[PDB]
Amino acid sequence: PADFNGTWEMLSNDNFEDVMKALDIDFATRKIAVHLKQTKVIVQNGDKFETKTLSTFRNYEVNFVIGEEFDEQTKGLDNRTVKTLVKWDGDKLVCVQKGEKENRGWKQWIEGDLLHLEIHCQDKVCHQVFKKKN
Template identity: 40%
Template sequence: MAEELLGCWKLVSSDNFDGYLKELGVNMATRMFVGTLKPEVHICKNGDKWSIKTVSSFQTTDVCFKLNEEFSEITPDKRKCKVRIITRHVQKE
């Protein structure tokens, strides 16, 4: 089910990303800069360990995790947070 996400993904467009960043408390200068980036995301899996690597002209981040397990992450703007990544299968009719 989640294996469908494996591969390389390129950002083509985003809607209201500035508003999302504003709600997170990201300052205006950073929001303006980040809004110009078009990152490429590589999603890989090795056994039960996942990796999401985000590559842009500004920086590269790599997050490794196991599904449904909480882990600590430092966001691209250097904030510390706790994260749990889960999957949910939705059957479409």
């Protein structure tokens, strides 16, 4: 479907603290992480994704293949073990992370040259927007 290949620098980050609080991240850490810029670096070969997040906050990778469930350690956030599975919803990526927290996952898609990421946990949702670098 879509082509996520590229380097994408964050434009905006809304309601990040709501999701971080839902993940039990401590307030001090939230206060640090809310004002930090992130870059996403993505290599996509068909259903194969290698993603790098880069910030002064946390650096982390997420590598997956569409429809292949994998065990994931969420180092960029709460450092929990979850079972992650990413699938297509048309041209959007929809990820379910099965573990201690209910209704956890994320959804990612492209509009023009912006990448949108929604991260959700429980009843909270964060919306991030990134601009393609080139």
